[PDB]
Amino acid sequence: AVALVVDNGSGMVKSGLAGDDAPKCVFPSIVGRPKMPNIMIGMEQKECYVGDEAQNKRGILTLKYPIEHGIVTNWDDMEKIWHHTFYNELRVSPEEHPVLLTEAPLNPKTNREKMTQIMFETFDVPAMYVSIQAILSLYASGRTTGIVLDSGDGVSHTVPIYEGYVLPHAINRIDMAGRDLTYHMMKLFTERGHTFTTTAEREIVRDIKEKLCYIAMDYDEELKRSEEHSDEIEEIYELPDGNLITVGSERFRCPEALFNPTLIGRECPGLHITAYQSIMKCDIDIRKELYNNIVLSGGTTMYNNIGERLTKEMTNLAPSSMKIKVIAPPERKYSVWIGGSILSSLSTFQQMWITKEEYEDSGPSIVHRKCF
Amino acid sequence: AVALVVDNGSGMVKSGLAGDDAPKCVFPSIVGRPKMPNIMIGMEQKECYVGDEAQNKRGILTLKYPIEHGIVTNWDDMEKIWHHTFYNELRVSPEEHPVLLTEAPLNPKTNREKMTQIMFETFDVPAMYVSIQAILSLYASGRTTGIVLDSGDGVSHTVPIYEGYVLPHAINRIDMAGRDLTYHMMKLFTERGHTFTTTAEREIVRDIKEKLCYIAMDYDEELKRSEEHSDEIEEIYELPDGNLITVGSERFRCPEALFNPTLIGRECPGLHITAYQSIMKCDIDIRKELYNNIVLSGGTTMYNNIGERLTKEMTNLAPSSMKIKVIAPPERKYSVWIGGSILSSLSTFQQMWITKEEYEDSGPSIVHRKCF
Amino acid sequence: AVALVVDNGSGMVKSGLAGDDAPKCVFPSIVGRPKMPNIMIGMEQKECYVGDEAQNKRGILTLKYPIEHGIVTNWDDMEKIWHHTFYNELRVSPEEHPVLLTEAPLNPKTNREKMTQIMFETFDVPAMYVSIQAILSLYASGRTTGIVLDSGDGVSHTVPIYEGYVLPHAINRIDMAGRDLTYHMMKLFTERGHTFTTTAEREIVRDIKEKLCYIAMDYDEELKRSEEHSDEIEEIYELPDGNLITVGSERFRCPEALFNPTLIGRECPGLHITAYQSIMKCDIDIRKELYNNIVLSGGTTMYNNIGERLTKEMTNLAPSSMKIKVIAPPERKYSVWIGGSILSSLSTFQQMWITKEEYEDSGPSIVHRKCF
């Protein structure tokens, strides 16, 4: 039977059938609830909107995210999202297809235990398997050795792998991703005169950041040019209500927080520093191959001139006799799903599944012995 | 049982059976009392005239309005008007038909409480329901999203609704309607030589205003043309006593007070300004749909070239990327009654009624929990 | 030379000499313009009234506020207000005294730039300095560590400070203050039968709110008692025209919007929630001292039983091993001015000034490098 690949994250959720080269259903993971009285008798209303319907009618809805920092806070909303994905988006019965789920490294055991319990006791799936996102990201690139720098919506992590062997003592994870960048962008916009506070305004700011941001090679030079050639940097954006907003110096000052987290008041190191620290925790003979297979993945790495900036930063830290090559292939925003689809279509993988009998006999703890 | 739709307002009262496409009995809400001695023995006189009879014999009667600014002042006259409507106009027993009444937004609770008490303890109606006029006006147009600008005889209000959800924090109401326009018309007529003071003269001036008024697209240009091409604007009107009156520049100077209330010494803003302020109090993503569904209702909006003037005024305020469409359908003077008839004929509405038992047990305050 | 302390806000403006323990001139910041024709030849009239004169003759004047949400909208009115303060109230020459101005956090740069330009190019002040209001509020209390919850007329903000170091990433600001409470009070009064629309009526409602409002410890219990013991809550107030108004349940329902902004249709969180969120954004070891130094400031915090309510609300959120102490000293409505006077009288502060030469050489942008 064809397996279901469901990559659930903080911001977006991707779902599809194992065997394709692109996800089938990509939708935001939000739950909307009405806050205004209903007075028009005759129409059929709903108590909760999930997915695109919640985003379209966000004007009269309060929006909640059931996943924060890769950890599920409310399980009812997550169960509703899973039900919507299975019964509305994919329109496939969740009882004849094995499930392949993804999880971030260094997560509490209770999250996996509850996820497995919900999958086996609510949807009654035949089999399921949970895998780390970095492994699937490395699978999607068709390589066996490299360091994966993944940056999603809530969690950014770094995982090195050498010749199919992972080094768990050199795995890094920090909670600083596109959401903090959106908050920083809102704070920067408050200095221009525009104030955004509501959830709909937050989505508008997120869209503005996605459409009109880039990474400057030299931050100081562009900052100097911002006060002298602002006409080149200014960009006009049309708000949904018809007003116009001028985005100027905020185009590159917002993504700069990745390489200097002190702007947003975070003591954690930057991205290049984290990668260098992760490389230096491995053996001496392993570092040479890791320096040449830096793979980028995640939606937060979809900016412009990011690979060149990362290469320049790594050059000033790595020894002058090494070769640094950053791998930023196109369509890398769906690399995890592609890797999961590739993994699920292998004959050797057809044995590493958690069947119903094993879960019923051993219990929910079996996920700590067969899934890694 | 067929329900009774009774829209009672300041100037006129409409009444009919739920299921028709037009009101059955439309008559002015006035109470007439004699002021001259009666010396002709042999005829059967009456102590009070209500409705058309009071208007026909207004020469020897003093006329009183029991409703002012949507608030009932004297309840005896209102009870007499209700009795006349039930027993003379409709000729139906008010004990086998549910009643559907209308009320203006932002009204005192005591008005609703006394109305419900009178309906349940005097006419002994089986069930009753009170609804806002804007909701019925939006029902009559067959829409679910829009901003309703209602202007009756004493009260003009603005209510936005988005996808069946009303925003109570963006509801406006001002006490400036056709009565102030009639007073302004009388004041303008005093400058020509004609003086009107009595109630009958007030009704004559109201008829003149109804028959010979229009809204000028450019007030300044027509004002300039008034002193140079008066022959085009002059109109002859025949008074009931046979005299002739020339209405000239007063044709467009009287309705102009809607867009500039400073003419009649009122500090409240105009109509377009009020609509724009009501639109700007909603969320950013809601404004686009509200700008495209401006619905006009009420008897005061039955002038000529009013939709074009409103569109031109809104264009200069709304952003240059929005589409403004004013909806002024024909027969809009009875839109509230049509909406009430449509609402009362729905199966889903057959449950939202205040039965006799509920009123007797809970008390008169129940109207504050089941009627909105 | 003695410095001038001028705290200009939305509602009121305070001005005095640095060295005193109380402001010298406290007057509303309104600009009045006549709207009626003048027919009495022989009297000397004025084209605009500013301050108490505008408030006394508000019957025949239209009143405008030149400051909205801590942002100056019209600069001509603000310049007139500054001229009135310097030349009429204080009666001191604005050329031999340094100026100390106050500003709210998270404000546009253009506001400060224009303020400095006006101060240096119109009044020709020798030196000036702009400071945040929270810093002065903390100075006035004689402390070094604490969280300041300031609530004025248009803007309410929260600023934590630990041992003289401010945490900019934990500063909150929302636009919800006494003006929205006045609007809510007017809306509540419309349900009793009284309608207030004009600016003079708005000032009357503001006075009623100032004189007859208090905060209920248990909102539900007092709401239940409102429908059973209204005689205890009813209060008689005398309108300027001689009529009497009964204020009953509206005494505590108006200030309740601070702890539940959903009543006035605002999605922003309440006051205790905002304070708790601001405390949780600091480091773990800093929270203990912040929980014990909650300082209240502003005119909107001059209600009754507000400290006890805030303490009770914070107790249910803070851990059961912390000590919560709300600091609400008397005369806290002028805390900002007292703090500014204390700061301006220090010898160490005699160097942090913007002289004429520095402004002339560097330009208006210098205020972004020496004032914080």
Ligand SMILES: Nc1ncnc2c1ncn2[C@@H]1O[C@H](COP(=O)(O)OP(=O)(O)O)[C@@H](O)[C@H]1O
């Ligand atoms: N073209 C783009 N440019 C800049 N940022 C982007 C772009 N596309 C997406 N993003 C950011 O990436 C985030 C999406 O992260 P995603 O990888 O979907 O998280 P998850 O791994 O939980 O699904 C969004 O919050 C958005 O801000």
Ligand SMILES: Nc1ncnc2c1ncn2[C@@H]1O[C@H](COP(=O)(O)OP(=O)(O)O)[C@@H](O)[C@H]1O
């Ligand atoms: N054709 C017309 N042209 C101009 N004004 C009109 C016209 N018809 C009615 N009016 C005005 O509308 C008013 C009637 O208001 P109406 O909607 O009946 O009030 P209510 O909602 O209380 O019944 C009258 O006072 C009259 O001046």
Ligand SMILES: Nc1ncnc2c1ncn2[C@@H]1O[C@H](COP(=O)(O)OP(=O)(O)O)[C@@H](O)[C@H]1O
């Ligand atoms: N005793 C009081 N009780 C309740 N509210 C008050 C009292 N005194 C003042 N206020 C409110 O505080 C507001 C004054 O705010 P203020 O601190 O003067 O603003 P700013 O900081 O801009 O000068 C007024 O709008 C008033 O409604």
Ligand SMILES: [Mg+2]
């Ligand atoms: Mg991801």
Ligand SMILES: [Mg+2]
């Ligand atoms: Mg009407």
Ligand SMILES: [Mg+2]
């Ligand atoms: Mg203040």
